[PDB]
């Protein structure tokens, strides 16, 4: 049990083989979830499940540079459900973030921010009860 929004420091940034695990439960009638891997004010990787975007469920991924959002990468597959416990795993690979939800591969997101060792915070926010947030090296 953690306060949301939650800031998880990533000491010395991220690196290939680093696995980030987020456990929580989606609130009833959730509207959004967000993971924000930050390089200072920039958002290297924004992972944003939207539960009701024009009555559709979509996950939006993007990068924010100098306060400007870039080109979104949208995904049809939506493994989250209001009310239900989830696990998000984000594995840093040399050329993308690889995301699995509930042990099923979901998406990958190519590195736009290439100073991986400066991506030194993860913000976790949105309509969840957050159980734990941690990392390990595989
Ligand atoms: C609907 O179908 C498609 C298909 C392909 C592309 C888009 C498009 O780029 N959509 C964009 C575009 O309309 C853009 C124009 O300003 O706005 C975004 S919304 C924006 O998308 C960002 C990612 O690209 C990011 O998710 C923004 N959210 C925030 O920055 C943010 C931060 C903290 C709290 C928070 O609460 C909602 C929001 C979020 O801003 S918010 O006002 O709705 O909260 C939208 O997805 C749409």
From Swiss-Prot:
A molecular function GO annotation: receptor ligand inhibitor activity
Membrane-traversing stretches: none
Identification of the protein by name: Galectin-3
Sequence positions bearing Phosphoserine: 76
Tissue expression: A major expression is found in the colonic epithelium. It is also abundant in the activated macrophages. Expressed in fetal membranes.
Binding positions (a beta-D-galactoside): 69-75
Chain's role: Galactose-specific lectin which binds IgE. May mediate with the alpha-3, beta-1 integrin the stimulation by CSPG4 of endothelial cells migration. Together with DMBT1, required for terminal differentiation of columnar epithelial cells during early embryogenesis. In the nucleus: acts as a pre-mRNA splicing factor. Involved in acute inflammatory responses including neutrophil activation and adhesion, chemoattraction of monocytes macrophages, opsonization of apoptotic neutrophils, and activation of mast cells.
Motif range (Nuclear export signal): 114-129
SUBUNIT field: Probably forms homo- or heterodimers. Interacts with DMBT1. Interacts with CD6 and ALCAM. Forms a complex with the ITGA3, ITGB1 and CSPG4. Interacts with LGALS3BP, LYPD3, ZFTRAF1 and UACA. Interacts with TRIM16; this interaction mediates autophagy of damage endomembranes. Interacts with cargo receptor TMED10; the interaction mediates the translocation from the cytoplasm into the ERGIC (endoplasmic reticulum-Golgi intermediate compartment) and thereby secretion.
Compartment(s) where it occurs, according to its Swiss-Prot or TrEMBL record: Cytoplasm; Nucleus; Secreted
Entry GO terms, CC: cell surface; collagen-containing extracellular matrix; cytoplasm; cytosol; extracellular exosome; extracellular region; extracellular space; ficolin-1-rich granule membrane
This protein's record includes keyword Secreted: yes
Keyword tags: Acetylation, Cytoplasm, Differentiation, Disulfide bond, IgE-binding protein, Immunity, Innate immunity, Lectin, mRNA processing, mRNA splicing, Nucleus, Phosphoprotein, Repeat, Secreted, Spliceosome
All residue ranges annotated as the Galectin domain in the record: 6-136
Gene behind this protein: LGALS3
Gene Ontology biological process terms from the UniProt entry: eosinophil chemotaxis; epithelial cell differentiation; innate immune response; macrophage chemotaxis; monocyte chemotaxis; mononuclear cell migration; mRNA processing; negative regulation of endocytosis
